Amino acid sequence: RIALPAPRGSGTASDDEFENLRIKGPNAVQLVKTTPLKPSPLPVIPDTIKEVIYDMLNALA
Amino acid sequence: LSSIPTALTRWTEECKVLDAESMHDCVSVVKVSIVNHLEFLRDEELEERREKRRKQ
């Protein structure tokens, strides 16, 4: 997510007018923040990928 | 252990070998799509923040 810099000054007429000038300006400093982790389930490994992983484990022996 | 190379370092090697200079071009093509989406969401969140301030 592109970061939001803090609200510079309370007040919509003036402070937010120059806060749009600052945050959305052509020349700006888009710092990044990550989203909160979404609960990804583990991907099921395909069977051919398990005949690749298993063949190396047999080459251990 | 830190001796083990990270995925980004393996992808870096792969990219180097398979496309040293075309990586920048792909970064540019994908950037054009990422920044536009994130700026739309940045402007929507900013509107949401101004709205919540006004409603407060």
Per the listing, tokens 């982790």 go with A37
Residue type, A59: A
- The data reach a resolution, in angstroms, of 3.1
Q: Which of A54, A10, A20 is nearest to B52 (CA)?
A: A10
Distances (CA, A) of A3 to A9, B6, B39: 17, 27, 10
Query: For residue B34, which residues of chain A lie inside 8 Å, CB to CB?
Result: none
Q: How was this structure determined?
A: cryo-EM
Contact A1, A34 (CB under 8 A): yes
Cα–Cα distance, A36 to B17 (Å, whole number):
34
Contact B54, A12 (CB under 8 A): yes
Q: Is B43 on the interface with A (CB under 8 A)?
A: yes
For the range B41-48, what are the long-range contacts, defined as Cβ-Cβ under 8 Å and sequence gap of 24 or more? B41/A1, B41/A2, B42/A1, B42/A2, B42/A4, B42/A23, B43/A24, B45/A1, B45/A4, B46/A4, B46/A20, B46/A23
Question: CA gyration radius for chain B?
Answer: 19
